[PDB]
Structure formats: C-alpha cells, structure tokens
Amino acid sequence: QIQTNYDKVVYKFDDMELDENLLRGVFGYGFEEPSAIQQRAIMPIIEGHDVLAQAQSGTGKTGTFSIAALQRIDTSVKAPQALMLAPTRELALQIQKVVMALAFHMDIKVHACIGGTSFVEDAEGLRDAQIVVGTPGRVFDNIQRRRFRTDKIKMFILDEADEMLSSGFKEQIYQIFTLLPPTTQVVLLSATMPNDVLEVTTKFMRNPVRILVKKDELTLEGIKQFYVNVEEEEYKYECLTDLYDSISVTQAVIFCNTRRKVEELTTKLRNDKFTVSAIYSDLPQQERDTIMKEFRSGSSRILISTDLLARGIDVQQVSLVINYDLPANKENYIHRIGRGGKGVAINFVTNEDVGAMRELEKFYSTQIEELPSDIATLLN
C-alpha cells in the first residue's frame, strides 16, 4: 500500500484549490478522480515541501508534478520558474505535451531543452520559457553557456530519477543542483528506491515528505528450517500423518509443486476426516476468499495450496508450514516461508531432493537442521 509522513489526502481535484484555468485543463485532458499518488503528492508539492514520491511511469505521475507545477507558476514572470528533467528526449517531449495540454486554458510557455535543436531556437526558447523540460546533459550545457538563466527557478522536478541515474546522469544532475537557487523546491519521482536515489534524497532534499510503496522483505529468521527424509515420494503422506500426533493444534499450511498433488493429498486426508481447506490458482474470486475465511476461522487446521499462490497467500496465524514437495525454483522458497515481521517450516525431501535442498542453503545462508523425534517442543 502506501507509507507516508505527510498523512493528508485529497480525493477530488475540486478540493485542491487549483486555479480555475488549470482545473479546466485537468478535466479537459481526461483526468476525472485523482489516482493514489495524485491524492497525496499534489498538495505537498503545491505547498512547497521537497517531495520524494515512488510512482510508476504513466500519465498519473506526469499529471502529478505537471498539475502542481502549473499551479505554482507566476504567469507574470516570463522566465524559467520550473525545471523538469527526464531520462530521454522522447520522455521529455511527452512531458512537454502533458503540461501543455494541462495548460490549454492558460498562457504559459513550455520549452523542451533536448537534443537536435539550433541553439538559436534553443536560446530563444529558454529566454521567455516559464517551464523548461529536457535531458540532464543538454540542460547543464545551456546553463553553463548562460543560455538558460536559473535565478527565477523555484521548482526542480526529477522524473524517473532511478532511470536517469542508471543512465549515467548523476554528475550533471549534481552539477545542476549547485547551479540552481539554494532554496529551490526539489521534487523526485521514482519507480524504485535504490541507494542512488537515496543518496540524492539525502544530499539535496530537506526534511522531505516521503510517499513510498510498502512492499516488504525476505526473512528466514523468524522461522526454523527443519527437514525430514521420507526417502521415497510414496512415504511422504504417512510421515505427514504421524506429524499430526505431537503438534497439538497450531494450524499449518502445506505446499505442493503440482495441483494434482494438492488434491490427492486433500482427498486422502479427507477420507480420514481430516478437515482440510484446498485452494487452487483458478477458483473464482468469490470462492477463494470463502475458503480463506473458513481457514482463518472455521476450525480447519490444515490449508493445502500450490506453489503458484505462495505470493498471494497471506500466511495467517500459522506457526507451522509444511513443504510436501520441495520447491522447484529456489526463489520461491521464501515466498512460502518468508514472514515480514514465531515460525516453523518443515521440509519433506526424498532420496532425490538431496543436494536440491542444499541449493536453498546456497541460494541463501540459513541452516536447515533435521527434525528431531521430539516435535511437541518445536511448536511451543
């Protein structure tokens, strides 16, 4: 979801105190209701804060800094007031179209400082322009050659910071900062939040409002890696049946590599009264949440599912997770036993899954001990 230190949302462009002309342009362009990032990032930008926003490429994001920037432009001033940087000529040109359209009912000049341009037209455009958009290299060159005066600049937008940095624009971006008024508001939009952006964020921004995407991490520390060698694929079921004698409730989830296995296991288990909840990557939306509600409530201590749902499966209050089938792809091991924030994971390997479980210890660095006869302990 969204993690932010601003906590203030506006749900409609009408409630943003937008100049009437800009607002006509917002609706005229096709914007109806603010998107998730627009409901949070526009106001803080308008208000003058330095803002760091994690936003995927798209018209929603472009609208965000475009709308805000147009709202802070002093039409009376016929000099650059806002500078927007992009990774490529094309992206810059697209941004210039968006702002232009948004300003369809206003009279603000927007210059594209990009490759392929007679410096005579470039000088002329950068003189009277109120919003300048271009690529780092070209922008820096024009600032150094005095063709682009930056004293009236009040806002600095860094679109796709990650891409710009990874494209090799770090030096020029850093140099642009020192060539812009020290008080300039800094706004940075980025799909990812790598150290490169964090570095810029920390060196150039001031107590910025941060609007980030939640996500989470791996983690195999809240869980204990225990395995059992059934030797033959055929002896797994009985080994799993014996486990349910020294566990005492706890409720567990069991993952299989194939859908059929999930059913056979479910069948064999139900043929013995074992009330198990089975879920496959195909049940309609209305049926999947029905089985989950039955598990996260209606008794049902066991929950069997395939490896494909591991990512979407919200391992509820489970103190035990069983791997009937050792994951096919090492990467999906944690998706099955991750937990982002007690924890026991038991693996059922045969006389073939050998060295295969070691890869899950090479792909990682955690220890997968053997399961001792004493189980009533391993589960609190």
Next chain:
Amino acid sequence: QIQTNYDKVVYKFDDMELDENLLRGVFGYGFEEPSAIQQRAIMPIIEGHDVLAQAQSGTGKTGTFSIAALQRIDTSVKAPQALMLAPTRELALQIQKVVMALAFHMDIKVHACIGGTSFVEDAEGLRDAQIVVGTPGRVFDNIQRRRFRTDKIKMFILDEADEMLSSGFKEQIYQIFTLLPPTTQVVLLSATMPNDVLEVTTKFMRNPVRILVKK
C-alpha cells in the same frame, strides 16, 4: 537558392521517421538540425526515388545519403544492400567513417572496397557487408571476379559524380550500372552539373527527383 521538383521539406530529424537507433546515431554524431540539402534530400532517398542532388563536399551532404541509406538497410539481410562510390580511397574511407558513426547504436557492417587490400580480406569483407563503399575500378574488378555479390543491392550512391567522371571512371561506372540489379535506386551527388553528369542522369536515372542550385 534551391530548385527542385520534389518540394517537400522536413526541418527536424524527429519528423523523418528514422529507426530510433539511427536517430540516436544522428544526434549522437553531432548533427543538430537538417541543413538545406538534408531537409530536401533525405526523405526522397528513403522513399525510393532516384535522386539527383547538387551538393558541395561536406559532412552535411555525406550525412544525407548515409542517413537515408542506413534507414533502408534490412538488418536481417547480411549481404550488400547499398553501394556508395567516391573519387578516391581517402574519400571512401571518410564516408565509411561517417556511416559507421551514424550506425553506432546499430549492428550494420560497412566494407571499404579500396586500393591495397588482400583479395582475401576483401572477399571476406564483401561476403556479409551490408553497405559497401569504394572506388569505381576496385568495385568493378571485385564484381567481375565475383567477390562482391550484387543481387541484393537496392541502392547505388554516386558521390561527387563530376569528380569521378573528371577522373576517368566513366566506363567503369557505366559497367557497374549494368552489373547491378536493373531496379536499383540511383542517388547522385555532385557539386557541378556538367554534361558528363547529365548524360549519366539521362541514361540511368528514372524520372528522378532533381534538387539543383539556382544558377
């Protein structure tokens, strides 16, 4: 200044519909905005017209047929598709240098069929070259001895035609035309338009677009 029968001008390279990599190559090379001849000559060449253009020596003229020729190349075909001729080895090498730069973000092979070159490497170079550039004699010789296959050639550029003719390459240039597939697009750049040039134009070009200088 210019007298043309094509009159259709383009002022920016963005408006020319160039493959993205080639365009990256154009700006990458230092080209900013199309010069007078580039504004008129590139598009007709790309479009397929036999073109006769009065242009003085220069990176502007070179860029003109180089950019067009690069847009027309078919990446999948690994055989000579364009043949460019210049009056001297030096001039040819310069041209190879210009198209190579222009093709920096592309994967095009450019072979120079010029003087002093092991008939072995010359052979290997022409086998999979997509753009071949060189002097009339060396090219004619390589076509006869069969080291240079021409069946895939779609464009024939004659740079500084007046100079090549004034240097005595007339016979060879004429022979090459007959050794190239009949439909090959013909492009001829020349500072002056003497009868030698007019004769070539009338004998080998088909209802060509003509881009000339006032006079």
